[PDB]
Amino acid sequence: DAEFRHDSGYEVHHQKLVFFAEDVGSNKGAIIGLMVGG
């Protein structure tokens, strides 16, 4: 669940970057390689 918001007012710039990220190169809460005998 992501809630991202950007509201601009009065901005004067040569360059501007707004970077919002969550899961970039990730395996959050993943199961990888599990053996259960029972």
Author numbering: 1 to 38
Q: How does the study describe this entry?
A:
Compared to our model, the previously reported model has the same sequence assignment for the N-terminal 23 residues of Aβ40, but the rest of the sequence is misaligned by up to two residues. The all-atom root mean square deviation (r.m.s.d.) between protofilaments from type 1 filaments of sarkosyl and aqueous extractions was 1.1 Å. Minor differences were due to a distinct side chain orientation of Y10. One of the two structures described in this preprint appears to be identical to the structure of the type 1 Aβ40 filaments that we report, including the new sequence assignment of the 15 C-terminal residues.
The ordered core of each protofilament consists of residues D1–G38 and comprises four β-strands (β1–β4) that extend from residues 2–8, 10–13, 15–22 and 34–36, respectively.
